[PDB]
Amino acid sequence: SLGNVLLVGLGAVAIQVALDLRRHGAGRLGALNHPGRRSQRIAEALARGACLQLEGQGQHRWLSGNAALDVFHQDPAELRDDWQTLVLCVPADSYLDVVRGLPWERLGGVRTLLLVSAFIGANLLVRSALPAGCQATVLSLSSYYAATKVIDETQPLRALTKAVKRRVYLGSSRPDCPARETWRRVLAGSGVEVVPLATPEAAEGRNVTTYVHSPFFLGEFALARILSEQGPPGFMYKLYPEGPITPGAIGAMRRLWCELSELLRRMGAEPLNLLRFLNDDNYPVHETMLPRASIDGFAEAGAERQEYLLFVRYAALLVDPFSPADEQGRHFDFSAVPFRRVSRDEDGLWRLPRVPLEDYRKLALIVALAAHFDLAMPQARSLLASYENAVSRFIDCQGASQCHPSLYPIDSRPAADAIYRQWCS
Amino acid sequence: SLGNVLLVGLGAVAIQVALDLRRHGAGRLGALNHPGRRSQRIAEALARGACLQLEGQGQHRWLSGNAALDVFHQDPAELRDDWQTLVLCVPADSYLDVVRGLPWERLGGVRTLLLVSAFIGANLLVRSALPAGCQATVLSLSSYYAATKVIDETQPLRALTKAVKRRVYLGSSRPDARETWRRVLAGSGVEVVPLATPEAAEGRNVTTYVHSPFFLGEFALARILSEQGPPGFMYKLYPEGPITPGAIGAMRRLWCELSELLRRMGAEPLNLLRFLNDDNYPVHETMLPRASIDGFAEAGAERQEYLLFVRYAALLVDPFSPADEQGRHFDFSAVPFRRVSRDEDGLWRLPRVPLEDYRKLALIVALAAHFDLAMPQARSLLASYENAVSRFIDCQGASQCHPSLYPIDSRPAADAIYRQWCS
Ligand SMILES: NC(=O)c1ccc[n+]([C@@H]2O[C@H](COP(=O)([O-])OP(=O)(O)OC[C@H]3O[C@@H](n4cnc5c(N)ncnc54)[C@H](OP(=O)(O)O)[C@@H]3O)[C@@H](O)[C@H]2O)c1
Ligand SMILES: NC(=O)c1ccc[n+]([C@@H]2O[C@H](COP(=O)([O-])OP(=O)(O)OC[C@H]3O[C@@H](n4cnc5c(N)ncnc54)[C@H](OP(=O)(O)O)[C@@H]3O)[C@@H](O)[C@H]2O)c1
Ligand SMILES: N[C@@H](CCN[C@@H](Cc1cnc[nH]1)C(=O)O)C(=O)O
Ligand SMILES: O=C(O)CCC(=O)C(=O)O
């Protein structure tokens, strides 16, 4: 079964996962979060008797519930060998740091480790970092299965889920893995269909953010908003000049999808139909905007038609076409998600938001991995260079002394080498 | 060169034109407005000392001015042969009726007749109704050159111009008066481009290309014929408005059909995307690259449809408007549909959009048949309108509907245009 489950990272994702785990049952539920203001707030909340609370928004209100946490650690030194399942709810660009940091000498009983938002190569990278002879199976979930936020960091244990995906995918380092069905059941509790796939990379190849955030949020427009201090933040899914979506961004999306598909084929994984994945698995539009024949036929449509269809898809979602119309015939403004921007941390250093720092670090690793398969990925490299140039100019202007080192050049070649060696073994 | 000018149809357009004529310099100013309540109000206002009053809104406030009306008629038979220039400021559907009603055999002094909103064939249709040997030159303007309205029908001669177009085109029945009218209209700020034939100007009417595919389709007609529910928006994407990839396909296919008709009538067609961007409302290079705009006519159908869709998506907000504090731009696309309304006799009427658009396209299709052009896309749009309006009549009752909703036959007008063109 799942046995006793340790959530690693206790954020918005973990709270939703905790609700789904408690519905399913069968064991103690613990969490580990590294020291910091959030962990201090969490420990304070738990010590006064608070529980994890998940609220569903709008149509998702049926999800809402509370979940008890048996133990919370902000000090790995107190962990003992009581855990059968680890669930990594930390940012995906931290999986390597987090897996190296776990006290594996006291975790010999762990039999499964789930990566809740994997990317191509993540399963292999995590396996490369495990201690020798570790017999934990590593599971890769394609994408986090919802949209969830901690409303008010002052109540760190209360989260809001505003969207839920129709379908996600799950692969395992163990062939014909029985744990996949367990997690199918756990996530089905929140209405998500989990499709088991035959290898981790096939699931990782269905990570939605890799395909969408890379072309849209590594470009010039997004970076100009994210690195700004004054002026409006702009909107993540609007068309230029309100947001980053342009025909050029759509062309980058198509070309990157082609590059990623070839990488997947070279790792023995079947690529996805990008339009059908976006429409059917994540969020749909009406037949009059995207005919089913166009959705199903997308992969054979030819580049111009593919780009037209992708553009239509995003223009069709500037509002939510399935939301109720208001008195004046308008639908919900689905595309008005503001960009989060750079902000100063407690040491006075500029930090980047997760979008795009996490998206850059993921894509940089994928590109470094693809080089081992003799794939140059020029579109991916152009997106990396756009981010790097913009951030470099921000450092020039603000001063290196004022910038957190996460803004600085990162070397992904060592991690890519570890992944490739693990794949070849 | 203008002499004494008679404005036929004394409404919003005529008031703007009168003030532009006065800025340029003209003789007496007269007007002919057919009997009706508007003419009754005009006659009383004139009796109490009213003049033609034009107000320019905002940046166009320099357009504002007053002009005396020297003569007002309602009955064409009462016109004296004292007019060198006639300007037709009536709806284009009425041009033939207006011309047939005038006593041309005793209007030998008329030298110029200007059609302010000429549809394809309008010049030829007008000339077909003129007596043989009639001396008048007929001018076709591609479209009215501003956006103007009578503020309040209780002060009938006071009009408001809220916008002026960038560019219009002017063609003449006489090879090589265009220059005079280019100057006159240039006083409003519009650039008038003289073209070599009337049909070249008539073929540059923007509503022909845009209103036909968007407002004769099923979505638009469902809004227009509706009584309850929100009216929807003319230029938003489905489900808020009628713009869909199917509507854009209709737009492209119709542009191809219209372009071939123009070529068969000896007129160079337009590059639709360049015409929309450069003559109507532009977008940024990142949405529509200049090379894609200039190259549109040679791009191939899929790219052409993608570019047109991008153009309308890019204008859901006005990208050159100032951003508000939230990074939002002006909601340019939220122009509500005008819908059916009961008239003073209690009868349902259609708004000019799409009635005028249907009538124009019906004539174009009937004309195209003479050039052996079937215009299947145009015919599909006509059928869409006819079927929807027919079902509205079924539901409301013919006795409750104004006769303008009933079937029309444009074949006699098309035949007269073709005969004139072959003359
Ligand atoms: N929430 C969503 O809807 C969503 C959507 C798409 C994808 N995702 C994926 O899920 C991941 C987690 O999302 P979330 O909303 O739960 O974020 P959250 O606010 O960041 O919670 C993440 C937890 O992990 C801790 N953490 C962050 N960085 C860490 C690091 N380098 N090492 C160890 N612990 C770290 C955090 O504690 P501290 O704050 O103290 O560091 C926090 O408790 C995202 O990064 C993304 O990969 C989530
Ligand atoms: N900004 C604009 O105003 C604009 C823009 C683009 C296109 N147009 C087109 O230009 C045409 C005229 O526009 P408008 O705004 O000036 O209309 P308007 O204000 O209603 O004026 C039309 C005038 O002509 C009269 N009239 C109609 N038929 C007549 C006839 N057969 N003989 C004599 N007088 C007649 C009308 O009187 P009754 O009201 O009694 O019929 C009215 O006084 C319209 O079809 C319009 O769609 C106008
Ligand atoms: N947020 C997603 C990334 C995909 N975003 C959606 C678009 C969208 C989301 N909200 C408003 N518009 C998509 O691109 O189809 C995730 O990673 O789960
Ligand atoms: O869905 C959003 O609102 C932002 C895009 C996204 O996928 C994310 O939160 O990582």
Coordinates of C-alpha atoms and ligand atoms in Angstrom, one line a residue, chain B residues 9-13 33-34 38 89-91 94 98 117 144 146-148 352 356, ligand 2:
Chain B
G9 CA -30.7 63.4 -48.6
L10 CA -30.2 66.0 -45.9
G11 CA -28.9 63.9 -43.0
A12 CA -25.6 63.4 -41.2
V13 CA -23.4 62.9 -44.2
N33 CA -35.1 65.5 -48.6
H34 CA -38.1 63.3 -49.4
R38 CA -37.6 64.3 -40.7
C89 CA -26.1 61.6 -49.4
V90 CA -29.0 59.0 -49.2
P91 CA -28.5 55.3 -48.5
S94 CA -31.8 54.4 -52.8
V98 CA -33.4 58.9 -56.4
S117 CA -21.0 55.6 -50.7
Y144 CA -18.2 58.1 -46.7
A146 CA -16.1 60.2 -41.6
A147 CA -18.3 58.9 -38.8
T148 CA -21.2 61.3 -38.2
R352 CA -28.7 49.2 -41.4
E356 CA -27.7 47.5 -46.2
Ligands
LIG2 N1 -21.1 58.1 -40.5 C1 -22.2 58.0 -41.3 O1 -23.2 58.7 -41.1 C2 -22.1 56.9 -42.4 C3 -21.0 56.1 -42.5 C4 -20.8 55.2 -43.4 C5 -21.9 55.0 -44.3 N2 -23.0 55.7 -44.3 C6 -24.1 55.5 -45.1 O2 -24.5 56.8 -45.9 C7 -25.8 56.7 -46.1 C8 -26.4 58.1 -45.5 O3 -25.9 58.1 -44.1 P1 -26.6 59.2 -43.1 O4 -26.0 58.9 -41.7 O5 -26.5 60.6 -43.5 O6 -28.2 58.8 -43.0 P2 -29.3 59.8 -42.3 O7 -28.8 60.8 -41.2 O8 -30.5 59.0 -41.9 O9 -29.7 60.8 -43.6 C9 -30.3 60.2 -44.8 C10 -31.1 61.4 -45.3 O10 -31.5 61.1 -46.5 C11 -33.1 61.1 -46.5 N3 -33.5 60.2 -47.5 C12 -33.5 58.8 -47.5 N4 -33.9 58.4 -48.7 C13 -34.1 59.5 -49.5 C14 -34.5 59.6 -50.8 N5 -34.8 58.4 -51.7 N6 -34.6 60.8 -51.4 C15 -34.4 61.9 -50.6 N7 -34.0 61.8 -49.3 C16 -33.8 60.6 -48.8 C17 -33.4 60.8 -45.2 O11 -34.7 61.2 -44.8 P3 -35.6 60.1 -44.0 O12 -34.9 59.9 -42.8 O13 -37.0 60.7 -43.9 O14 -35.7 58.9 -44.9 C18 -32.3 61.6 -44.4 O15 -32.7 62.9 -44.2 C19 -26.4 55.6 -45.2 O16 -26.9 54.5 -45.9 C20 -25.1 55.2 -44.4 O17 -25.3 53.7 -44.0 C21 -23.1 56.7 -43.3

